[PDB]
């Protein structure tokens, strides 16, 4: 599988994908592939109001067989807190 | 169109559904356990696994990292840990009835040390399933024993009298971590990943590990390493006299106890 990718077209797609109650934040990513809880994964995430691809080295905390996929918890480093901050600020309605 | 003010008001309600889902899992089989083999590095191996909690809802599987922040906020962690210990003992009964001498290592937090339900659950469940207490191993983080010492000491006496083993995880990162042990004598120590992760490359870590095992062995305390992911780590642990290893080099976590102990 290698590089997971998720582009969210709009704020409704973000609101629906985002896991606000996970420590450090998380996000649901579609993928047909088989992961185990606790796997380290690399994800490139694109958010509604920009073209910038944001790198996330996250951990699998959820598996589902709507879509097949995984819930990915953001890491606690500056890269994880950065992506959380950007998502939460977006979903607050902000510039 | 996304309405941010509406989303802000719906949050409180999203949290309430989660809490109810957790409370409902305290009753039945909505929680479950997966198992990670823990292998003896030095001689004939006990059939030992560590339990990991999951929550399952309609085929979806969740790590405690998905829900533990909610559980903490609603003071459900002690109930959840009681649930795991009860379930684990039930599993030991199931294994025993099929002819297996299985042991299980389970996590409990420091608020379980003064939980009268915990001690009762262990006694009552071991008797319901006819499981010898020696089959149940209970681990808590070193840092948390330090900050709850007197209740930890009382728990340790009560549970040790049932033949269960009580040990520490995330052990050894600290100046003389062996100094807690003057006040709390564990059956086993599981080394902090901060010490063991770079063991193949850092002599700083290699010294700390030999420091720990030279003090553990003469006291008859077992030592253990986790997140063991490569062979050079196995080699270093073996030479340092570490008793047990677990991690992806040995075996993944999974639903079944099908590991052939070697
Ligand atoms: N400990 C350990 N884990 C390994 C190892 N090899 C691979 N892993 C995986 O790596 C993750 C490490 O989490 P942790 O530090 O144990 O952190 C754990 C722990 O904080 C909590 N947790 C997991 N199981 C239990 C439990 O039975 N009781 C309690 N109270 N907490 C649990 O959930 C976190 C995530 O657990 P998982 O999603 O299962 O994901 C786990 C686990 O599946 C290993 O040698 N040792
Ligand atoms: Ca809010
Ligand atoms: Ca409670």
PDB file of N, CA and C and ligand atoms in Angstrom, chain B residues 74-79, ligand 3:
ATOM      1  N   UNK B  74     -14.804  10.369  32.381  1.00  0.00           N
ATOM      2  CA  UNK B  74     -15.989   9.900  33.112  1.00  0.00           C
ATOM      3  C   UNK B  74     -15.697   8.870  34.204  1.00  0.00           C
ATOM      4  N   UNK B  75     -14.425   8.753  34.603  1.00  0.00           N
ATOM      5  CA  UNK B  75     -13.967   7.904  35.682  1.00  0.00           C
ATOM      6  C   UNK B  75     -14.474   6.482  35.505  1.00  0.00           C
ATOM      7  N   UNK B  76     -14.266   5.947  34.296  1.00  0.00           N
ATOM      8  CA  UNK B  76     -14.606   4.573  33.967  1.00  0.00           C
ATOM      9  C   UNK B  76     -13.401   3.644  33.886  1.00  0.00           C
ATOM     10  N   UNK B  77     -12.183   4.151  34.094  1.00  0.00           N
ATOM     11  CA  UNK B  77     -10.986   3.332  33.903  1.00  0.00           C
ATOM     12  C   UNK B  77     -10.916   2.183  34.907  1.00  0.00           C
ATOM     13  N   UNK B  78     -11.310   2.404  36.154  1.00  0.00           N
ATOM     14  CA  UNK B  78     -11.238   1.336  37.128  1.00  0.00           C
ATOM     15  C   UNK B  78     -12.233   0.181  36.799  1.00  0.00           C
ATOM     16  N   UNK B  79     -13.406   0.505  36.296  1.00  0.00           N
ATOM     17  CA  UNK B  79     -14.416  -0.451  35.897  1.00  0.00           C
ATOM     18  C   UNK B  79     -13.944  -1.234  34.676  1.00  0.00           C
TER      19      UNK B  79
HETATM   20 CA1  LIG C   3     -15.625   4.928  38.412  1.00  0.00          CA
END
